[PDB]
């Protein structure tokens, strides 16, 4: 039975511009997360060099309304102060405009090298996925409800995850235990 850290504790990571794990027991693995608006070429390098493929912008309802994305095949980068948007510097400065509640289609080119998702309203209540999750812990922390998640390159799978969130800082937690705090605290 691996140690989990609190959901309060994933908070307090979000907020201070740190990333986070979470696991849900849907498919059984981890995302490294943390909010869109706190990206930095030193926090995206450090998602580059662990995910398994795709970097993804989980952002609330509303604002994939306002960018006109409605209900991978959408890819982003930021239009302009970029290089070819591929670099740390460039997903974090996209990221960061996707989080910025005055963008616009216009403000983005596709395709592109950040993939957006669209959160359920409700989040975690709704939809237990990594995508409500991202969006929860952002707006749980006070921040913008855009979040920044990568499926990390893959119990024995649990058990790993717990060293190397350790190794570099991070809290481990479930998506259940987010549910469960929300449900008490909302």
């Not at 691996?2 to 504790?9: A, C, I, K, N």
């Not at 395709?111 to 209540?125: E, F, Q, S, T």
Request: hydrophobic share 45%; charged share 25%.
């Amino acid at each position: 039975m691996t140690r989990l850290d609190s959901v309060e504790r994933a908070v307090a990571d979000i907020a201070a511009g740190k990333a986070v794990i979470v696991i849900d027991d849907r498919e059984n693995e981890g995302d490294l997360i943390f909010a869109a608006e706190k990206a930095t070429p030193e926090m995206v390098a450090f998602m580059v060099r662990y995910t398994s493929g795709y970097l993804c912008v989980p952002l609330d309802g509303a604002i994939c309304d306002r960018l006109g994305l409605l209900p991978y095949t959408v890819t982003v980068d930021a239009r302009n102060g970029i290089g070819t948007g591929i670099s740390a510097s460039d997903r974090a400065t996209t990221m960061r405009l996707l989080a910025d509640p005055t963008s616009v289609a216009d403000d983005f080119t596709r395709p592109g090298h950040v993939v957006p998702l669209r959160a359920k309203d409700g989040g975690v209540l709704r939809r237990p996925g990594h995508t409500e999750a991202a969006v929860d812990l952002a707006r749980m922390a006070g921040l913008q409800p855009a979040g920044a998640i990568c499926e990390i390159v893959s119990m024995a799978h649990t058990d790993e995850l717990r060293v190397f969130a350790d190794e570099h800082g991070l809290a481990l937690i479930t998506i259940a235990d987010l549910i469960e705090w929300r449900r008490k605290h909302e």
